[PDB]
Amino acid sequence: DFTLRNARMDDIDQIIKINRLTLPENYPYYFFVEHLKEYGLAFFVAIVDNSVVGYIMPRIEWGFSNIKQLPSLVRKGEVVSIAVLEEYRRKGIATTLLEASMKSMKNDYNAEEIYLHVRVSNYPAIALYEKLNFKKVKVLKGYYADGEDAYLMARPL
C-alpha cells in the first residue's frame, strides 16, 4: 500500500525526477515551488516507504467556463500535471490523488469546475479521467512541443 499527503518543499526534488521520468513536459524548479506555494492544499504526493512515487500539481484561476457558455468569469481548478511511477501503477494511486486534489479545489479554493489537457493518444490517462467524469471539450491542434494534439477535458464540481 501507499499513503497520501500534501506536497512539501522537501518533496520537490523527488517530484521533479518523477516528472522527467514519466513526462516530456518538464517544468522547472521554481514552477513546482510557486504552485506548491499558491495552491498547496490541492498539491498531493503518494508515499511508499519514505519515498514519493507520484504527485498531482494543481492550479486555481479565474476564467471562462468549459461547462456552460457564460460571458462572466467562473472559478476553475486545473490539473497542471499528474504522474505515478511505472512500478506503482494500476493500484488506484492516480485515482486517489485526483479525488484528493479535486476535493480541495472544491472546498479550499471554491472552484466550480475543473479542467486539464492530455495528449490525444494518452489512452490510459484519458481512460482515468473519463472514469472520474471528465469529458472532451475541445481538440487543441499541435498543442504539445513534439506536435501532438491535445484534448481539453473538463468536469463540473
Residues near ligand ACO, by CB under 6 A = 22-23, 79, 81-84, 89-95, 116, 118, 122, 124-125, 127-128, 131
CB of 59 closer than 8 Å to CB of 32 = no
Stretch that binds Ca ion, among 8-16, 44-52, 67-75, 111-119 (CB under 5 A): 111-119
Residue 118 in contact with Ca ion, rule: CB under 5 A: yes
Beta bridge partners of 35: none
CA distance 119 to 126: 8
Based on its alpha-carbon atoms, the radius of gyration of the chain, rounded to whole angstroms, reads 15
Least Cβ distance, residue 8 to Ca ion (angstroms):
26
Residue 56 in contact with Ca ion, rule: CB under 5 A: no
Q: Which residue type is seen at 76?
A: K
Binding site for Ca ion (CB under 5 A): 118-119, 122
